[PDB]
């Protein structure tokens, strides 16, 4: 008869808890770049969690930082899906 007040939220974080997130000054951020690409390619095909899983893999595999500073060079990123959704989410219908 009631639902939790915190139900039906989804937080699509660009990066893992505690980590920096990487943004390229020319191309945009790794996560948003990848998110738009996967939405473009799969929003008419895949449930949203499966889209965001493809985003995770794209960021994790295709990106690595390049820096003149050894501290910030050659670093990686994994985004972080936090789902308190109660149903599957398809952007298409019918």
């Amino acid at each position: 008869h009631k639902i939790p007040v915190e139900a039906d939220f989804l937080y699509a974080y660009s990066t893992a808890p505690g980590y920096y997130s990487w943004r390229n000054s020319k191309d945009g951020s790794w996560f948003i770049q990848s998110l738009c690409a996967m939405l473009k390619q799969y929003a008419d095909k895949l449930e949203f969690m499966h889209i965001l899983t493809r985003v995770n893999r794209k960021v994790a595999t295709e990106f690595e930082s390049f820096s003149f500073d050894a501290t910030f060079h050659a670093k990686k990123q994994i985004p972080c899906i936090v789902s308190m959704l109660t149903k599957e989410l398809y952007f298409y219908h019918l």
Binding site: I3, P4, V5, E6, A7, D8, F9, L10, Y11, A12, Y13, S14, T15, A16, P17, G18, Y19, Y20, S21, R23, N24, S25, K26, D27, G28, S29, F31, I32, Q33, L35, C36, L39, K40, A43, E47, E64, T71, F72, A74, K75, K76, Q77, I78, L85, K87, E88, L89, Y90, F91, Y92, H93, L94
Partner: protein
């Protein structure tokens, strides 16, 4: 009618819903936060992407912490009855649990609380998506060879 299942959100309301994009690029000098070059590329990509998903996109640029809270409050008090979902994209500096307005931080919890099922009834039972491009701390991932 025949047997029915309800494993998926109803996304055939008359409207998909709002897509609020908060694009913070330039920060007040007194904060000591750097400009976020490339974020306009992000904001434009998101606008186009969610436009093609039939969201009502609203882009907002360089909002103070006060403007962020007031925008979210006002959006949460709209009538979302005819909308399937709600999307908010935050592009800014951040740390764990925090997003930065141009003049200081905003608790992510304060933003999302406006959309609680008991505080935004016309979005209750509907998916509320928060997409957050922002740091969550200062750790770096060194990776491992495959």
């Amino acid at each position: 009618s025949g047997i029915s299942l309800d494993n998926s959100y109803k996304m055939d309301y008359p409207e998909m819903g709002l897509c609020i994009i908060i694009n913070n690029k330039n920060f007040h000098k007194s904060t000591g936060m750097t400009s976020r070059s490339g974020t306009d590329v992000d904001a434009a990509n998101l606008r186009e992407t969610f436009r093609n998903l039939k969201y009502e996109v609203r882009n907002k640029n360089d909002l103070t912490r006060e403007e962020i809270v007031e925008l979210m409050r006002d959006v949460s008090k709209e009538d979302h009855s005819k909308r399937s979902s709600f999307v908010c994209v935050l592009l800014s500096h951040g740390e764990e649990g925090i997003i930065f307005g141009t003049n200081g931080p905003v608790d992510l919890k304060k933003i999302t609380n406006f959309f609680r099922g008991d505080r935004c009834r016309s979005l209750a039972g509907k998916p509320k998506l928060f997409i957050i491009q922002a740091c969550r701390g200062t750790e770096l991932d060194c990776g491992i060879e495959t």
